[PDB]
Design a protein around this ligand. Sequence first.
Ligand SMILES: [Mg+2]
Length: 123
Amino acid sequence: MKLLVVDDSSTMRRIIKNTLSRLGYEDVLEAEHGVEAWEKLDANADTKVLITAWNMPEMNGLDLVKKVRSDSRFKEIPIIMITTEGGKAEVITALKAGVNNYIVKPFTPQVLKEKLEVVLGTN
Ligand SMILES: [Mg+2]
């Protein structure tokens, strides 16, 4: 169960990684921007779950998600967006692009655990 977590906020990366860890998910690769996230996906196609923010330089997560969905080896990859984009327009925009679960920032560590548990259960 190989996860890639993409967020330009290093403390958010920390929280998601620790929370994944507490749910029994240890094989987490990180990225800061959509470009590095795409290169990582592209070079490590055995990745199982993409977790991405939206707002970031060097390609936003929306364009990251569309680029992932268009790729022939990532059509069924589960995509979780974790974003401050709480507006429904953005939720709609993102499900349209291929986002499968949407978690809205901000959250307590314990709220993130409950919410990731809903999507991923434990491993
Ligand atoms: Mg936040």
